[PDB]
PDB file of C-alpha atoms and ligand atoms in Angstrom:
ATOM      1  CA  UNK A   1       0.000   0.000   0.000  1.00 47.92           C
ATOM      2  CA  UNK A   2       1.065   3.180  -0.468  1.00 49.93           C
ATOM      3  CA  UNK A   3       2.053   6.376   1.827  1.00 47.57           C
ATOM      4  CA  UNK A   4      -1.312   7.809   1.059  1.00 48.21           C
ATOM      5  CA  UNK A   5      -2.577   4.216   2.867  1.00 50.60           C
ATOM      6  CA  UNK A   6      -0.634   3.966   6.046  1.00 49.47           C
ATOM      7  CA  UNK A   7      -1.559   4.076   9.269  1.00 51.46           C
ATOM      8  CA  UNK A   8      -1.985   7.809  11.281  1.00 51.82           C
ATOM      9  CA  UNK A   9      -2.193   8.970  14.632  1.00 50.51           C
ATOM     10  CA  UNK A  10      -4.791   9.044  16.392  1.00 49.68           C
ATOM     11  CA  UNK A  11      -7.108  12.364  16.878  1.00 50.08           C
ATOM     12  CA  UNK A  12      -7.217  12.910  20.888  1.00 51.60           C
ATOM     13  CA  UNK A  13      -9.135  15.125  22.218  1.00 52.30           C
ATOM     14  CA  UNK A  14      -6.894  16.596  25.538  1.00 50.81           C
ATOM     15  CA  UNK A  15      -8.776  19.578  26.636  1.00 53.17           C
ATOM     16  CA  UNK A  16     -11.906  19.670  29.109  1.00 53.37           C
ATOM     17  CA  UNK A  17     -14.668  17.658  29.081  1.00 55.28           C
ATOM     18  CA  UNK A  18     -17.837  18.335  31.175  1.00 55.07           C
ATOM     19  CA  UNK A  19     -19.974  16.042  31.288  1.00 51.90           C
ATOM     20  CA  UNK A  20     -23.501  16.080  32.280  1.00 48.28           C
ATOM     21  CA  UNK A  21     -26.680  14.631  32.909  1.00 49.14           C
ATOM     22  CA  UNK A  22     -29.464  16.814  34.696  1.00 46.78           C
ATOM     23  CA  UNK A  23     -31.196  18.889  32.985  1.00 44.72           C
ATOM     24  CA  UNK A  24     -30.892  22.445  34.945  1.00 45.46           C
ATOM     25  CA  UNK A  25     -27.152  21.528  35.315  1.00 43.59           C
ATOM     26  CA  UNK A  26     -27.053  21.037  31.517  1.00 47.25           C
ATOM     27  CA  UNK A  27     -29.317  24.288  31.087  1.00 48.91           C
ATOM     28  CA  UNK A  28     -26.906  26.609  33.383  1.00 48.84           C
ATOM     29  CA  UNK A  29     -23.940  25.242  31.253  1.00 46.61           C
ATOM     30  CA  UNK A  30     -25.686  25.966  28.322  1.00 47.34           C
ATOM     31  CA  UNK A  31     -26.017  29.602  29.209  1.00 47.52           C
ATOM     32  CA  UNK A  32     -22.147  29.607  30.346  1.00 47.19           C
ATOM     33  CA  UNK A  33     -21.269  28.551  26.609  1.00 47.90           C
ATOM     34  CA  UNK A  34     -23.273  31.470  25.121  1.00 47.18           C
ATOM     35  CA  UNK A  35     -21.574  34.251  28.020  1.00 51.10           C
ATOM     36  CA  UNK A  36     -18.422  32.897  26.347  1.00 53.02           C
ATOM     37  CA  UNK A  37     -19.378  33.640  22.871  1.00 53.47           C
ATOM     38  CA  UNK A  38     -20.302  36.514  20.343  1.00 55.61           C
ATOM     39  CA  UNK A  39     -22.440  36.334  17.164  1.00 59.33           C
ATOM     40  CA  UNK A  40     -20.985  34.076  14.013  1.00 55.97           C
ATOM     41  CA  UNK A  41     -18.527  31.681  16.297  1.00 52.15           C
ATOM     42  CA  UNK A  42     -18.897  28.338  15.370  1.00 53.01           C
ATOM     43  CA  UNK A  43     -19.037  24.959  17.152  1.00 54.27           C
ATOM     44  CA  UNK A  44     -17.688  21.656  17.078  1.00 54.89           C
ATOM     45  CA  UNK A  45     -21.688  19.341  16.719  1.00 51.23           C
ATOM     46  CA  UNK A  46     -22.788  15.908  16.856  1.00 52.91           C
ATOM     47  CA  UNK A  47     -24.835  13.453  18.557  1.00 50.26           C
ATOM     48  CA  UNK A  48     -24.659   9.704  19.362  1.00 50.59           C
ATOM     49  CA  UNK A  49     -27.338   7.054  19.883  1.00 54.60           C
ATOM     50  CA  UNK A  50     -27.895   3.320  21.354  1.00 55.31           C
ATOM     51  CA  UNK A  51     -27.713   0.661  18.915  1.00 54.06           C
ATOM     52  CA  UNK A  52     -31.326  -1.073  19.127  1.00 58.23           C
ATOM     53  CA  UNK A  53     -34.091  -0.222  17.070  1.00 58.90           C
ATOM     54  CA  UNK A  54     -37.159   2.231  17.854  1.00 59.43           C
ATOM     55  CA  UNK A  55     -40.413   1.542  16.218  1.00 58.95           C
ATOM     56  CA  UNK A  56     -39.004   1.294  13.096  1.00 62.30           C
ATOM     57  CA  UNK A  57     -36.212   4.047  13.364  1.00 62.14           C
ATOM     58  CA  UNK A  58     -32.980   4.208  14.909  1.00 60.27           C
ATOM     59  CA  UNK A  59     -32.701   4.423  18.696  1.00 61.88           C
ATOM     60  CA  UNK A  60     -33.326   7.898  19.869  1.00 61.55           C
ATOM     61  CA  UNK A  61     -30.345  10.513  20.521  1.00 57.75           C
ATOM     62  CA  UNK A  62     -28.870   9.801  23.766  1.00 61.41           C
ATOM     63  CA  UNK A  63     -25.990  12.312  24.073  1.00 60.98           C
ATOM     64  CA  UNK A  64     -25.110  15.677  22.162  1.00 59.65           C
ATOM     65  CA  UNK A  65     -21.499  17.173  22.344  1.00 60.26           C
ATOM     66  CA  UNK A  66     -20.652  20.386  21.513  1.00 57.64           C
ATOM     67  CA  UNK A  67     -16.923  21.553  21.153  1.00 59.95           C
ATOM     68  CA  UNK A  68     -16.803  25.626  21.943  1.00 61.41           C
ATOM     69  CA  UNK A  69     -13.230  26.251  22.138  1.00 63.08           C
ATOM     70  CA  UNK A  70      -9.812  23.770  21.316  1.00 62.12           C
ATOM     71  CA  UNK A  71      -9.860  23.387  24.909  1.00 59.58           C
ATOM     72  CA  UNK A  72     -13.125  22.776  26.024  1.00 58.67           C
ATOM     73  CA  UNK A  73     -15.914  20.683  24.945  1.00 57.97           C
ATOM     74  CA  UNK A  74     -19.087  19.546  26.231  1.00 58.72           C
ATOM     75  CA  UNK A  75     -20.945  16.258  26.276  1.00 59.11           C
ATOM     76  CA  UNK A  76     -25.206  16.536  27.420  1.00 58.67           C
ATOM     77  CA  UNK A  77     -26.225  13.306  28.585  1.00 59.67           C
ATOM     78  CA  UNK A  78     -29.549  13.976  27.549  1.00 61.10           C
ATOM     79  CA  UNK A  79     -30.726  10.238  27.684  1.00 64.83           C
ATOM     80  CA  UNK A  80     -30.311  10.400  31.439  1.00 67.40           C
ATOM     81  CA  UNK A  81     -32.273  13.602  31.811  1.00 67.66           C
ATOM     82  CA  UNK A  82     -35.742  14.027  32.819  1.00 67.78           C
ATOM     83  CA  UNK A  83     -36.725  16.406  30.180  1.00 68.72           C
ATOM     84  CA  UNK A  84     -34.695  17.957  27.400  1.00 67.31           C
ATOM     85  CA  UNK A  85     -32.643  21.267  28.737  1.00 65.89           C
ATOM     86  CA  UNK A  86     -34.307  24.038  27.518  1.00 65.60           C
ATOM     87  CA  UNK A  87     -31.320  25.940  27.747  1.00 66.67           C
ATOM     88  CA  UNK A  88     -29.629  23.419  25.596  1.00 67.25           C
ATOM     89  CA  UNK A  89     -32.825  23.675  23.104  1.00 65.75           C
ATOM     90  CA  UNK A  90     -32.717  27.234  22.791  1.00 62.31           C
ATOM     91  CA  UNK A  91     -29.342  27.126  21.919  1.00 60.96           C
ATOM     92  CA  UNK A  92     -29.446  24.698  19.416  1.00 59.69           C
ATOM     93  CA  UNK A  93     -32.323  26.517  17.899  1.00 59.93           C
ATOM     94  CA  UNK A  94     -30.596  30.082  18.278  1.00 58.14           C
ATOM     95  CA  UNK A  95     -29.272  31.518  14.718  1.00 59.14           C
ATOM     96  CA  UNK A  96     -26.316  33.270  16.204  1.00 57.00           C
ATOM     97  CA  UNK A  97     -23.887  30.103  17.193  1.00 56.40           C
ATOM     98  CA  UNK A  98     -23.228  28.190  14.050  1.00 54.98           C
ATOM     99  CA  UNK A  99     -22.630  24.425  14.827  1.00 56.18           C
ATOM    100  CA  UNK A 100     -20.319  22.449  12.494  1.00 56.15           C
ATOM    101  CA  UNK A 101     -20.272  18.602  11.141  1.00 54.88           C
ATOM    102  CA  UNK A 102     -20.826  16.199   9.033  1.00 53.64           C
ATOM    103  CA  UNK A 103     -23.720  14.629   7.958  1.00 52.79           C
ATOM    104  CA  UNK A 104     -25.176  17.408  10.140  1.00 53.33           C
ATOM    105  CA  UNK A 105     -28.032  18.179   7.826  1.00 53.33           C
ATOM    106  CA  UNK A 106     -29.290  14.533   8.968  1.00 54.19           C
ATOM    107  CA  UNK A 107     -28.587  15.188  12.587  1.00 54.05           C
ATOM    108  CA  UNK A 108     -31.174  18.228  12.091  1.00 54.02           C
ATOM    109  CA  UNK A 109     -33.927  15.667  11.242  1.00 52.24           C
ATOM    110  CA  UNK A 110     -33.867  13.138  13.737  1.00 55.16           C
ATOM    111  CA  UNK A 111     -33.153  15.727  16.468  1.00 57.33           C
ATOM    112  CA  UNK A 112     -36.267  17.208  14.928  1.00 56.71           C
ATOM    113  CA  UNK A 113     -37.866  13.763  15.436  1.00 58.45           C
ATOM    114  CA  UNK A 114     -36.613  12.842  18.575  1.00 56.38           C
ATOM    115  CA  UNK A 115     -36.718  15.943  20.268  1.00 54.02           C
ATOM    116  CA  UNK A 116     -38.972  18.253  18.108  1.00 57.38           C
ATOM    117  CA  UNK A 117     -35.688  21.032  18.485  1.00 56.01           C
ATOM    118  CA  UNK A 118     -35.069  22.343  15.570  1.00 56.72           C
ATOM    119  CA  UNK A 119     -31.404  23.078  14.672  1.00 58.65           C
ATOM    120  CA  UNK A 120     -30.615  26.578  13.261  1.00 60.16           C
ATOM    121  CA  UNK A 121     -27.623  27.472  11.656  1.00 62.08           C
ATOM    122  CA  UNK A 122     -25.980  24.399  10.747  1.00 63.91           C
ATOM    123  CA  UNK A 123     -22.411  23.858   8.405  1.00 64.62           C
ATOM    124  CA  UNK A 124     -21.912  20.803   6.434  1.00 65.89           C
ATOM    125  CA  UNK A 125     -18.087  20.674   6.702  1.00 64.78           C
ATOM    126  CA  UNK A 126     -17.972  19.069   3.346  1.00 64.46           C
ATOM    127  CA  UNK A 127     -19.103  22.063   1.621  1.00 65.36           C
ATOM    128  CA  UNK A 128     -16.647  24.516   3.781  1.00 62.56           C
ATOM    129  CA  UNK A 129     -13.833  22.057   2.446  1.00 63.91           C
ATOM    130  CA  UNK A 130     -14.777  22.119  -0.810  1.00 65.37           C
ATOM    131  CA  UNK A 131     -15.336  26.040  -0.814  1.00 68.34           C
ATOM    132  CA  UNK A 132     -12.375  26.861   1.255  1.00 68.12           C
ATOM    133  CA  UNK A 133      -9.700  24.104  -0.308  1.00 66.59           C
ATOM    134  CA  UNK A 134     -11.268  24.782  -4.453  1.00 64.49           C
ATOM    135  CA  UNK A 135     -11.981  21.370  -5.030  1.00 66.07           C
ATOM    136  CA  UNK A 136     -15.261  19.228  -5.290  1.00 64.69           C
ATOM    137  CA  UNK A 137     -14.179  16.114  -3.242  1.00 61.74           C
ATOM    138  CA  UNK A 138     -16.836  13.638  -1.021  1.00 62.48           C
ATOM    139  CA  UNK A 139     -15.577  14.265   2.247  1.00 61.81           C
ATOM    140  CA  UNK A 140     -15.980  12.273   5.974  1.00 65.04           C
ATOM    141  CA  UNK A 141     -15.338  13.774   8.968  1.00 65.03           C
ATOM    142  CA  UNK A 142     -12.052  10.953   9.057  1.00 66.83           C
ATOM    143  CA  UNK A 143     -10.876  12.154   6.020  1.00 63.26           C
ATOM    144  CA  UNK A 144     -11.127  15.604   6.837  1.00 59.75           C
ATOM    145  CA  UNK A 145      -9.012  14.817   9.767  1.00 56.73           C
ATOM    146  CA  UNK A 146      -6.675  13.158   7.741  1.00 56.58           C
ATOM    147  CA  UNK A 147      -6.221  15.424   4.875  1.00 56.64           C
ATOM    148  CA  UNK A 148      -6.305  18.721   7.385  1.00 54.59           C
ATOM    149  CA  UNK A 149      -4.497  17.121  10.621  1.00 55.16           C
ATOM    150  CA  UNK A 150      -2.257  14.035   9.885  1.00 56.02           C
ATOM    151  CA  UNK A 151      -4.286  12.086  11.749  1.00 55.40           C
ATOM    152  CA  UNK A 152      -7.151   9.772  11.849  1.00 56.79           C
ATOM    153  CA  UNK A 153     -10.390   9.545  14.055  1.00 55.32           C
ATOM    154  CA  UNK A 154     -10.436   6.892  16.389  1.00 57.21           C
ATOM    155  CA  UNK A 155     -11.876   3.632  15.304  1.00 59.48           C
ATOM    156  CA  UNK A 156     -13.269   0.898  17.989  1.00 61.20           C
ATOM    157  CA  UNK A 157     -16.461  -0.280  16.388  1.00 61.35           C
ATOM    158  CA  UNK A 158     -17.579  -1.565  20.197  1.00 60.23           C
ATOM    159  CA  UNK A 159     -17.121   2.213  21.135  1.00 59.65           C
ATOM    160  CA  UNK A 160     -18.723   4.030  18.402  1.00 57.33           C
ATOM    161  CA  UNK A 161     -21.876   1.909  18.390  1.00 58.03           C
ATOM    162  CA  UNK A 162     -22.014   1.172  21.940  1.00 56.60           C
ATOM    163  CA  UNK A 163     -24.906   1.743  23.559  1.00 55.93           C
ATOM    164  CA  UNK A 164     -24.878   5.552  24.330  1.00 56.78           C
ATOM    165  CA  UNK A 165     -28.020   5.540  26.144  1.00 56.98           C
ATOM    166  CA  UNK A 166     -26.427   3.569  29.074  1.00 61.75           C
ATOM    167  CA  UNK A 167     -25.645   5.560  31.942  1.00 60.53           C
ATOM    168  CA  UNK A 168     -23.061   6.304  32.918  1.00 59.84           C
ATOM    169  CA  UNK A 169     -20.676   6.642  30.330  1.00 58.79           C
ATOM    170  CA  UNK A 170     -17.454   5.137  30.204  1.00 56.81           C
ATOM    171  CA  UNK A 171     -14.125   6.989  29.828  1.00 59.00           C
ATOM    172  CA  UNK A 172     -14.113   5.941  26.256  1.00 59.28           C
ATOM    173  CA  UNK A 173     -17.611   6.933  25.064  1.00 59.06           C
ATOM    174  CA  UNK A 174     -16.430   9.971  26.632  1.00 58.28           C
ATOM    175  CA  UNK A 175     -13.443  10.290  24.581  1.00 59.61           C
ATOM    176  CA  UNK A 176     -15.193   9.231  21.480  1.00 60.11           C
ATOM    177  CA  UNK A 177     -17.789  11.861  21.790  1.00 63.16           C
ATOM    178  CA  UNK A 178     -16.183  14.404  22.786  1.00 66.17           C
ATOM    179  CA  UNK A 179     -13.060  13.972  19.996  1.00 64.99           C
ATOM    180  CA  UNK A 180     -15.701  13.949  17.148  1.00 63.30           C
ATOM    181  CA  UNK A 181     -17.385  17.495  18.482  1.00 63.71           C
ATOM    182  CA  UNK A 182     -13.171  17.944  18.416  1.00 63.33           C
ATOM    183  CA  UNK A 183     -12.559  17.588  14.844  1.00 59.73           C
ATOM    184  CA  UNK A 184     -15.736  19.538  13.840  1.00 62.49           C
ATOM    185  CA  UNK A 185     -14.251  22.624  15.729  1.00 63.20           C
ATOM    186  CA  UNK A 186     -10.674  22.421  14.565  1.00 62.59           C
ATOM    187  CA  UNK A 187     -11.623  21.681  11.049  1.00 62.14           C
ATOM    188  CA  UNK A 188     -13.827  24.944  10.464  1.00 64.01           C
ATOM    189  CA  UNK A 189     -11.383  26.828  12.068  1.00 63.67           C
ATOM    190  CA  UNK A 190      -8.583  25.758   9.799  1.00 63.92           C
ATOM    191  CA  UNK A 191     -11.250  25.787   7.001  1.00 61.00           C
ATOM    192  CA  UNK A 192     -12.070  29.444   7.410  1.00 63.13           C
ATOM    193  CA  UNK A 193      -8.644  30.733   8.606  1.00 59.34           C
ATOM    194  CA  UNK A 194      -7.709  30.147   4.419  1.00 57.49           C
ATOM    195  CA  UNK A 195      -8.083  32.874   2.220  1.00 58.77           C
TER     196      UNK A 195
HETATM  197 MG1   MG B 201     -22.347  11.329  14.111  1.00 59.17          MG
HETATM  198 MG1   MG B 202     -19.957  10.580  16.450  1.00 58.88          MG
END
């Protein structure tokens, strides 16, 4: 195989991770993300979910990270809450903190129909890249990573499809999660630092 093909580093998130998984808690930290931020910044999104089947869909989100800063991210055990944060749902739905991903556009729905929250303001990284880097390429969040970074998003399939939903959540899920929110951060930054 070639050099193209071997075998990178892994992406590690380092910084802070809060983690919670009450609902006022997760509302209060909600508000401490937007006293930290103005109009236009962007965040690292995403969301995981248990394995199992719903009623012919897949399980329902369980836990939504969101990456505000390369040093901090944040990781809302929603499955394990009582009612969804309204905090939390007024800042997904609030126009004036952008939230960047992949596949994001399908996180939207889903978090629609899960949680009737509807997600304002979303970036598909894969249209920044192709904007920002003049090409028209089919990007993943991995290769992203790779082709921005030099390094590759973790990979243990028992950890990325583990059952999110159980509580709590082990150092790994934790890792997982909060390293993809990561990558969506660090990529639009690069992405729009280019000019
Ligand atoms: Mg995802
Ligand atoms: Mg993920």
């Amino acid at each position: 195989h070639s050099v193209f093909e071997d075998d990178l580093p892994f992406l590690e998130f380092t910084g802070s991770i809060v983690y919670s998984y009450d609902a006022s808690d997760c509302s209060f930290l909600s508000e401490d993300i937007s006293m930290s931020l103005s109009d236009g910044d962007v965040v690292g999104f995403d969301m995981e979910w248990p394995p199992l089947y719903n009623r012919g869909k897949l399980g329902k989100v369980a836990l939504i990270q969101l990456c505000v800063s390369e040093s901090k991210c944040y990781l809302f055990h929603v499955s394990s809450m009582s009612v969804f944060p309204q905090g939390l749902k007024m800042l997904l739905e609030n126009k004036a903190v952008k939230k960047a991903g992949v596949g994001i556009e399908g996180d939207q729905w889903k978090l629609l129909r899960d949680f009737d929250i509807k997600l304002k303001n979303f970036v598909e990284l894969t249209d920044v890249a192709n904007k920002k880097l003049k090409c028209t390429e089919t990007w993943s969040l991995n290769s992203l990573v790779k082709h921005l970074l030099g390094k590759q998003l973790l990979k243990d399939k028992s950890i990325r499809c583990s059952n999110w939903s159980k509580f709590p959540l082990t150092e790994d899920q934790k890792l997982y999660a909060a390293t993809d929110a990561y990558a969506g951060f660090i990529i639009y930054r690069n992405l729009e630092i280019l000019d």
